[PDB]
Design a protein around this ligand. Structure first.
Ligand SMILES: O=C1[C@@H](O)[C@@H](O)O[C@H](CO)[C@H]1O
Ligand SMILES: O=C1[C@@H](O)[C@@H](O)O[C@H](CO)[C@H]1O
Ligand SMILES: [Ca+2]
Ligand SMILES: [Ca+2]
Lengths: 255, 255
């Protein structure tokens, strides 16, 4: 009925503690219990930012409208267990004109500035993103190429086809499967895209994106070898300054 | 049909009066009516400078050729309503060898001198600028870095790519969209640059510009927190001493 799941407590720390989490007959582990943030923490932090709350059995982000600014007590949220071959399923609801995202294979990455100080880099320069978006009112829906910044897209690389999202304020179902390099995105019980990590196709997608070797050398390096040496990393959700809700979050380990 | 739009009458005043302005079916408000300067005033002033006139349904600046001097009854012009999330569309036409600009998120800023007197600061140390330029004849087109002073650039920070400006004396279409910190410049119906305010990437752009913390500490402080505490400000156009025409000036409020 339950499985032990290790988790880390702070930036780049080892997974030295474990939670007993429910698992169903098909192997899905419920990683959000509807009541606590146990195992969850802010990306780069040792605590859950206070703009993330629990309401009506959902993880809620309380956004102030600043986009990428991540002002206030915000920042992205991760479940602090590295997964490798997994299938994640969760429900998401976005506010009108809102933007968030579901990250996977994420690494906590710092760089050094010219004086040797640390700089925490964005989660999205190591983590592929399943976009979360109000496709009718957020301008990102019209940017990019072939609708590849609309909901359930692999952000700036592969559009969701079919684009079957429900409108803002409605619950959508997300699926992200990563299995030995094969990745599938699902939206509302349909597979909307499929790709293969660490291939020539993967490099070509990156080189056509905002993360190309020319535009963002660090991002290209991280994403081209997605997941680092061990090809694993965190699932998480995006602070993009907008109200968004997530619930019924469960993960099946596939090997 | 029409919508009430509040405006201020003088330096740093409250927007305690309103105009009834046309709004079309897509939500764009026409803020220049082709006939009057209602709601417009000089930056830092309680009136429209007399070098700004209305000529054949256009706002025209009548330049004497002094560049930054702002001699005579000149100075920059603002529409005195603070916008936060918005899309601006307008047409611009420059004289041969001419220079102007479209400002956004502008603040009316004063500093104090050594004796405690007020000093009105330039609009462009608070306001990002969409450069307006004759790219073939004005020397700005060869200055700066990577063409970041040509038309539709974020002046001294990000070049317009592609550089699709029409020649001098021809009408160009400008788009400025600010949506929860995401900024896009459009020129002649193409998006030519995109950036995100209040991020580490924004700070780095400023720190490489004429507005860096080392070169211009007040400008750095204002622009790094662009739009002030409430992240809003005025749209306006530049007196850079050259004849320039503006028309079809429309703004959609995006939230
Ligand atoms: O939604 C997004 C965009 O609006 C923009 O902020 O870039 C983000 C990171 O690639 C993406 O998550
Ligand atoms: O056009 C311009 C340049 O020629 C120079 O005067 O600086 C101005 C303010 O940054 C800019 O608008
Ligand atoms: Ca997103
Ligand atoms: Ca200018």
């Amino acid at each position: 009925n339950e499985v032990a799941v290790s988790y880390s407590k702070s930036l780049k720390a080892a997974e030295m503690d474990s939670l007993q989490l429910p698992v169903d007959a098909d192997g899905y582990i419920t990683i959000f219990d509807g009541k606590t943030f146990n195992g969850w923490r802010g990306y780069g932090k040792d605590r859950v930012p206070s703009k993330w709350t629990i309401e009506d059995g959902c993880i809620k982000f309380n956004g102030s409208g600043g986009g990428e600014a991540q002002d206030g007590d915000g920042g992205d949220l991760i479940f602090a267990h590295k997964f490798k071959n997994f299938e994640l399923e969760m429900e998401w609801k976005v506010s009108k004109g809102g933007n968030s995202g579901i990250f996977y294979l994420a690494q906590e990455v710092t760089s050094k500035d010219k004086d040797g100080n640390d700089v925490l880099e964005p989660i999205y320069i190591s983590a592929p993103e399943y976009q979360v978006l109000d496709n009718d009112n957020h301008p990102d829906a019209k940017l990019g190429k072939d609708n590849n910044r609309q909901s359930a897209s692999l952000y700036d690389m592969i559009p969701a086809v079919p684009q079957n999202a429900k409108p803002f304020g409605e619950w959508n179902k997300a699926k992200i499967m990563v299995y030995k390099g094969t990745v599938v995105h699902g939206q509302n019980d349909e597979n909307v895209l499929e790709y293969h990590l660490w291939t020539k196709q993967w490099t070509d997608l990156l080189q056509a994106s905002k993360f190309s070797q020319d535009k963002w050398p660090l991002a290209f390096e991280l994403l081209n070898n997605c997941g680092g040496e061990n090809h694993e990393g965190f699932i998480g959700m995006q602070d993009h300054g907008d109200d968004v809700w997530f619930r019924n979050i469960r993960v099946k380990v596939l090997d």
